Amino acid sequence: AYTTFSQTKNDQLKEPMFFGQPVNVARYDQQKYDIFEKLIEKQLSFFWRPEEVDVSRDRIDYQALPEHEKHIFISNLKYQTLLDSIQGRSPNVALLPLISIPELETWVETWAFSETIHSRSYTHIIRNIVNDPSVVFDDIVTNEQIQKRAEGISSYYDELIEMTSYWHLLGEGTHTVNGKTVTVSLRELKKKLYLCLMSVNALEAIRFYVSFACSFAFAERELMEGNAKIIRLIARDEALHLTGTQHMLNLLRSGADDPEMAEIAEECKQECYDLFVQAAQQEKDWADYLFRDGSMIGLNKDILCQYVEYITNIRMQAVGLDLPFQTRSNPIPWINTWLVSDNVQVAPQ
């Protein structure tokens, strides 16, 4: 019962963010939640094209890198390309059919779109620094370490999408499908959404920031500077994206938007804390992979793992979760130079 133009004239200011009447009119003169309208406007104001950035001198730098420094750089680039391949499509496929207010629907489409620009930018970098991009793009799918991350991350989306389809096709209840039981529960579907959004928040707010530290470590060395110009633009967008999901999560758990979500967010608080901790442990294990053949000036496994803990505590606090790690100061304060924009706070605070 998904409908691309629902016929009921409903008050869009009183719909929940999710699971209400699907959005009919796209109107932008009023919002339930003006954060999403502000995010659209910012993201539109940031519009950039990757070919705006000259990455010519990055091919020379990359060829000069010792083999383990190529390994750090190219592994980081492949991981980012994986993540925004997923982020390109997934917010649209997974969330659009669930959204019941226009500002959020348009934010999600704007968000996903901005991710396709990131993917396009990773292609621009790749084709400029290697002789055969196919090798790189194929390794994104087959690489043992990258695949493990792809599998976990994609499962949050995939499960929400499948359950969403059952909800739209069958509605709430207990059902018979080819002689087996299928229980469709809005409460469970709400839990799937909440976890998926927690996972997407950890992806943009933690996993990509770990990756930024790697890119900007090269830039600190005055290497791969075209790459770094692009990552500055990407990071400025990412700051919006993670703000968007922090607001979605916080509005859902407060009870303001849907009192039932408040109880659901409370039920699965341990599951969320665990998902976040798991993501952080995975980014630390990724550090171990990046640096398994040696580190470089200014960044190694120990430093990068401290940064994982530092940023994870900040991001978890922002969505109301307990801190998993000891308090610590920023282990790499130089990163804040690269994570700065006049029109949004790009660095964690």
Added chain:
Amino acid sequence: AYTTFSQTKNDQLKEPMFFGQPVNVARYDQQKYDIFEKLIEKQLSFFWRPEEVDVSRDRIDYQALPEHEKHIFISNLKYQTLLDSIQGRSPNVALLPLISIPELETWVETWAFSETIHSRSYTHIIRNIVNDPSVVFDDIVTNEQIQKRAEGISSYYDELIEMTSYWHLLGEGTHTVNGKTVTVSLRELKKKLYLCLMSVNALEAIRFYVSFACSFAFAERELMEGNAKIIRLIARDEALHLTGTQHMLNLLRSGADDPEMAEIAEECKQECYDLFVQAAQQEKDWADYLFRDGSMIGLNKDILCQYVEYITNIRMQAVGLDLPFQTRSNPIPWINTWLVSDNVQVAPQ
């Protein structure tokens, strides 16, 4: 029959460089070979003290280096310290008792002295960048790779010294020592000297220049810059030292100084070519050791081995030997910035 003041009033302008009457009067108003007087004057004009150089910021750089870059740096430093531990004492112990003209005798003492300043400078660097210098100094003696080089290099000196003592004690002839035959031959002793000087030429002209490339590669990266200031001073001295032995070798083989040496140099020309080639192969194997855990920006095994071939051809040509390697251009032209002085040509030409 070594005498510290020989009583015969001899014409010092007609003595050979070596094996003549030991020098009585040290006079500097005339020379047989004014190259040696020019070298003394230059070396005196270059006099420096290692504490003139601030190496404080090298401790911070060294601590920031990844472990394999520490390995490159500290292995290179240990090898240099080994070489000038030997060069500090060895020219004096091995050549002074053989010298029969005053300008050469004083050049050798000035040379050896300048080497003690180099050793003192390596102590200055070591104690400033590590917490426990004893570990470093002990590893110079025990390190498998360094010891192999020490053994070969020291043998050229040690054999000349032993034979020299037999010559001084027993003179030319066939002798009985504790019931065995000892043949003392001036011709063989002359051959020992010539080979030893060929070995010392390869040491200063090739082995130390390979090492300079390593030091200056860090400086190109703006790392270990105090070390590099010291190496610039050391390299300026080394240019004199190798000039000194190029002249000794060339004057000996031309017949000008001792017609018999000319025939001896011709006899053992293959042995010299082989010694040089061996030294070069050893410096290439050393490159393989330096970079066994990874290389760094601007210098790796392949580049350093090209530089070994490039400099070896130049140095071998300068002492009349055939070139072992294909013609090639300087693989690291940036090194010539560091190897430059207004008052001597420091870089190979």
